[PDB]
From a paper:
The ﬁrst crystal structure of a TPR domain showed that the repeat units are helical hairpins, stacked into a continuous, right-handed superhelical architecture with an inner groove that mediates the interaction with target proteins. We concatenated three copies of RPS20-hhta as an initial construct, connected by the TPR consensus loop sequence (DPNN).
M4NΔC is M4N without stop helix. We conclude that in the amplified constructs, the observed interactions are more favorable than the interaction with the native stop helix, releasing it and rendering it prone to degradation. This led us to ask whether this helix is in fact dispensable. We obtained two structures for M4NΔC from different crystal forms at 2.0 Å and 1.7 Å resolution, respectively, the first (CF I) with two dimers in the ASU and the second (CF II) with a single chain in the ASU, for which we constructed the dimer by crystallographic symmetry. (a) Two dimers in the ASU of M4NΔC CF I. (b) Dimer constructed by applying the crystallographic symmetry to the single chain in the ASU of M4NΔC CF II. All three dimers superimpose to the M4N dimer with Cα RMSD below 1.9 Å.
Author numbering:
A (entry chain A), B (entry chain A): 1 to 107
């Protein structure tokens, strides 16, 4: 599993303060399967950690656009936006997740 | 960093379908610093993946109790509860996270 290996390598590089390299390997992981929401989310989180907030938000928004009713992706985007000082924007995404949980409760 | 090493080992064991072993090493990681919200959350997610839903929820609830205003922990607990068929319980946690984002927006 090349996505797995690249993701593991990126994690190890980031853990040890080589996150520019980590980002490169996570980008490669995305190219191997660009529709993988988990890879997209992992790259976004790494980007955010490294101060690339604009790009992180773009990637997390992409992950949402590819499955807009996913409460995990929605809440991750909300948390990312809030942490990046865009709480006003963040709240509509977390409210969407609430509404989807509410729908689930209703069945 | 023993928590790091144990967490890496657990990830590698789980990735390769030895998640009973992974859980043991994640439990060890928690014992090294039981107040670490990230370790607690990581163990909870692993537990949930392995069908130990009750225990996963306990650990994620603990992570929330140790920092009850953390929107990441709250939204993770909500997502976990929803995925485990407890959407009604899940919604109060995600609504709390919304309210905290709302407070943040207001400053």
């Amino acid at each position: 599993n090349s996505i797995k290996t690249l993701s593991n390598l990126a994690n190890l590089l980031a853990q040890e303060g080589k996150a520019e390299e980590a980002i490169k390997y996570m980008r490669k992981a995305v190219s191997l399967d660009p529709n993988n929401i988990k890879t997209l989310s992992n790259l976004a989180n790494l980007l955010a950690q490294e101060g690339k907030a604009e790009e992180a938000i773009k990637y997390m928004r992409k992950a949402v656009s590819l499955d807009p009713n996913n409460i995990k992706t929605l809440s991750n985007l909300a948390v990312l936006l809030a942490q990046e000082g865009k709480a006003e924007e963040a709240i509509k995404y977390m409210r969407k997740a609430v509404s989807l949980i509410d729908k689930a409760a209703k069945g």
